[PDB]
Amino acid sequence: TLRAAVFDLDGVLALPAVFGVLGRTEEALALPRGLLNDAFQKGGPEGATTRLMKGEITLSQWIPLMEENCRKCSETAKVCLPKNFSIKEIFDKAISARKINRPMLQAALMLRKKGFTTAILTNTWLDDRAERDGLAQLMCELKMHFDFLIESCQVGMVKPEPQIYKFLLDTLKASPSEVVFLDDIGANLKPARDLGMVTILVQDTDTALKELEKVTGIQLLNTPAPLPTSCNPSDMSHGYVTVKPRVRLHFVELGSGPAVCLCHGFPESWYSWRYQIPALAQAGYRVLAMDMKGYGESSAPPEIEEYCMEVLCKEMVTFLDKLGLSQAVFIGHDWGGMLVWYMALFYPERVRAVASLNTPFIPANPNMSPLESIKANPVFDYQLYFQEPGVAEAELEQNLSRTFKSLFRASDESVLSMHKVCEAGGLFVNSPEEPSLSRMVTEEEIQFYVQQFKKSGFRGPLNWYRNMERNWKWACKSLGRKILIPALMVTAEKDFVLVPQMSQHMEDWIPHLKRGHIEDCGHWTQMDKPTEVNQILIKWLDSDAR
Amino acid sequence: TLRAAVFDLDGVLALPAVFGVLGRTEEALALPRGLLNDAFQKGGPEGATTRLMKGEITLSQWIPLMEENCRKCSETAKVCLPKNFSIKEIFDKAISARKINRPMLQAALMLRKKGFTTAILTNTWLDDRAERDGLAQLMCELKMHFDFLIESCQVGMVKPEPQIYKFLLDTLKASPSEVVFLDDIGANLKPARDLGMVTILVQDTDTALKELEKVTGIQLLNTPAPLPTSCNPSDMSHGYVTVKPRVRLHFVELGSGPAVCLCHGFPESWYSWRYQIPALAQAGYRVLAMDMKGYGESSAPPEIEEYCMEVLCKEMVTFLDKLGLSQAVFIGHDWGGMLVWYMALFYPERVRAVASLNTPFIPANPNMSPLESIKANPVFDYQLYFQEPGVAEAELEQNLSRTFKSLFRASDESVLSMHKVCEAGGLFVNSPEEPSLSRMVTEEEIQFYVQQFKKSGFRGPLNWYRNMERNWKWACKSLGRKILIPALMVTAEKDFVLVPQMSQHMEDWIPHLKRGHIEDCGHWTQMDKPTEVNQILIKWLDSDAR
Ligand SMILES: Cc1n[nH]cc1-c1ccccc1
């Protein structure tokens, strides 16, 4: 029975294959057929290309050897190479044109998700070209999705040598009959077949996946659209910055490029951004996904005033200072979205660009108490229930599993009365004891939140809602200002508290405001519609944040 | 008695002052004298500029108001503003031209070092211009060196209003007679003088520093060249990455830009790079200063084989993978320098550029055992003393304070026989019990190393020296290769083990190799000559790493 799947890189996980480009170059240059492909494999096991693939020499050392091979091949065939013939130019162009074969990677992902051990087995080289980064990027993206990466130039062996196949089996800890092996080269497939492995000769991707589906008994073609890559907490880089003697902020960090600071809402975690972190890093950004003050591995001081917007914003400025960052793009959701607008208003020089999911920017009304304003909208009734220290902490901490399962639900899975709350006496009056698992979250994801909240509970988080008067006084100082830095407002059609209509007047205060809108999306935007969130954020970052 | 020093930003810590540029623009445009300076201060406490400085409006909102003021001023004076008159262009240019007044900052640094509380008190604005980053960078660099930064636009008060001065005193927790106040504006200096503060009217920096020196009784002018900014461990961002089930790597992180991975030697710490970390981040790089495997907060497994170069290099590749970095510049010293050459040789695609301090690149001799080679050079005798598990651990762990004080010494402060070692029976035979403190290190810096080494001791560190045969076998695979990526070799004149002469044949293997050389420099390069190291590294990074 199959339990491992092995994929080649060139012509399988990345397209197009070398044989095709050498063929195309020959056709473009009107060279004798097979000349370049012939000079490339010249000397077989004793040739320059074999030395390169075994890691005896680097790619830059191999270029001049390939050039000699081309000249010998041209001399024997009595033809002339064009005056401006450059192997370097040809090879630079072909490497950069090579892209991940997305449906093949999709199939590898599905097999692993079903319990298969997956590996990449490739005849590759040590790339020291000035343009090597393009290749490093492709390999870094690809490799993360597999259990193993076996590179000919690292192991000192090449396909079709029999030893690399026994090495592969040793690495997989599998018998040949338990392995499917996919390769676009018939000669490289043969030794695997000779050992008793299932082999797939890859020409067109669709037929290869049909053969793969048939042999594994797992549907790989025509499948529903997969979710974006998520995060495994234990595999992330965890960062810790002391912003003041009693306060440290924890963050998860991924990628290179402009700094993008993600700010979660209530009662959440850096983990609420799990589907955005890999996508934004792959899009060319350095992601800093915070545990906001009062949450997860960040400090959670007990005092209400430690959670006013002025204090929270000052600490995020200190966070940047200590990291040596002059700016960051600030992206927030819910209370994180509230924080990001205030960062834009009070610290524009430190904010490269600002984006909020669900949370609109509404200027403080100096002629009305926030308490007065809140009471007028019945959907904000829970905020009044949250005021009394200890009451909401007791209900929310009673059963963490129940709390998160009740909260984290799609628009059609509501389980709690988002009413009063106060008069019903609790957010969970008439709510199930053991709610059903939302289609949005797995049991494992719920248990992560449960474990995070065992450290500090709900006091710090609830304190974000206990500074209404103080926040209002501070916000009143900004009434003569406008937000003129790049800004994005993302509305969620089915957030029944932070309704899209609440954002309708934002252009009065943010004239250059850009927008996104997500249909059939509840309050938990990032995990409700991750694909849509990623598309909106990346498009906006690439156009307005650089 | 004075115990606090307050500095203005414009015309004191940053030059040149606004009044001068407005004057220059008037002269350049042949405008009536004082026209622009007049439109700028128009309306005094009720004017647009006061609203801007109090933070009522942002800089972008203030530009159009300043333009109207200019037109009213031109109308009354019966003159015409040129057709292409742009306040935006003028102000953009003046902000970018403004630079830190280095001697003034030097004096502020010296006063704080002597126990003064230091602060910046500035009439500033909320910058939302597309070019705001230039200013954010200047402020971020400046602010780190002071106890307080008081900005008019954050506190809603301006100089010369009396309240800002009482606010300043409250912040400093000082009586007016304990404060020196430096300002280039006479009107802004007056309220401080009226309270009883010592005041310095700053015109030319040298005279201001003479007045400052006289009043504080501390030499500030003509002082010896200061050391580069160091690191306070508790103020750094600390990162942690699990590279394998039992191994986590710790690093300190600072700055934005291309990733620069610093790799310390034996028996050191990320802290050995303390003078490089702020300088390289300020130079525009994202510094990742490692605790190498076996050190500080990184894991220290007991097995010798966990410390072979092949394993160490693979883990540094995993470290990059987990951080989502396709490449990093690798800079190493001693064993870190050995690691970086092997990273360049085995993982060129992951290495943006490579630099080593002291450690040369010498290819493995396949016709000789490393043990054979080592024995031939008497300066490497200690490496033979290090071979036996437990012997060197016992001597080095006996008294950590003694160990680090004996090791970390300048070229003229040698305290140990760097002889055999074996026959003398210990690195500390005939060495003092309580060595004198080297001019290179403070007691506090020594105690940091002492505290780091209490966690894992010397087993992991010494294991770096216990893989000679294994490292030699692995290095022999790379004999046909050359290092063709950007590379820098830095020699230290007075390193009596890793002598500059050992690097003499490197161009045979690294044809494009660039070099640096440090005179009167012992083995501990980074702390021996930090200014020189910073100059060499930054110049090289800017030309070859980007
Ligand atoms: C920020 C926020 N997140 N969720 C609900 C929120 C609020 C907060 C104050 C007032 C109205 C609504």
Ligand SMILES: Cc1n[nH]cc1-c1ccccc1
């Ligand atoms: C916590 C919260 N803040 N704002 C809205 C919230 C919701 C929305 C839907 C279901 C539960 C909770």
Ligand SMILES: Cc1n[nH]cc1-c1ccccc1
């Ligand atoms: C309380 C309030 N009233 N109006 C606006 C308010 C804010 C402002 C900043 C942060 C939270 C809430």
Ligand SMILES: Cc1n[nH]cc1-c1ccccc1
């Ligand atoms: C790397 C290193 N750092 N210091 C001394 C070193 C060595 C190591 C092996 C062989 C000779 C010299």
Ligand SMILES: Cc1n[nH]cc1-c1ccccc1
């Ligand atoms: C540890 C070490 N490795 N190489 C050279 C070393 C020195 C050099 C001078 C003084 C003490 C130790």
Ligand SMILES: Cc1n[nH]cc1-c1ccccc1
């Ligand atoms: C032992 C040895 N002999 N020659 C070169 C050697 C190396 C190579 C890599 C790392 C440490 C030492």
